[PDB]
Amino acid sequence: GAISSVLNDILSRLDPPEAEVQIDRLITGRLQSLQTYVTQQLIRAAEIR
Amino acid sequence: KNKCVNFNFNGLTGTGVLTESNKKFLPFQQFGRDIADTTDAVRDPQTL
Numbered sequence A: 001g002a003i004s005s006v007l008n009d010i011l012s013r014l015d016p017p018e019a020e021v022q023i024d025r026l027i028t029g030r031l032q033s034l035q036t037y038v039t040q041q042l043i044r045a046a047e048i049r
Numbered sequence B: 001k002n003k004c005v006n007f008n009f010n011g012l013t014g015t016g017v018l019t020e021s022n023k024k025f026l027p028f029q030q031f032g033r034d035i036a037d038t039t040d041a042v043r044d045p046q047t048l
Helices: A007-013 A016-048
Strands: B004-009 B012-017 B039-041
Touching (some): A007 A016, A007 B012
């Protein structure tokens, strides 16, 4: 949902108050991406053991 | 070169070690990207 996936672009374009909105969108999704990875690794961890 | 530096080229901001690359870009090509879509290499606009 962010204007651009590059953080440097958001900081080099939008003002400080406007950049926080775009950066929050990227962080929120990247959190879900890590949660998906760890979730799968824990499942596979039970299989390999 | 051969040092980690903050480079800004044609408005592209980033931090990385600058080194000479053997990859040949066609005259029209500008910036390359790796498997991760991150910049693989850049081009100095003044001295090509």
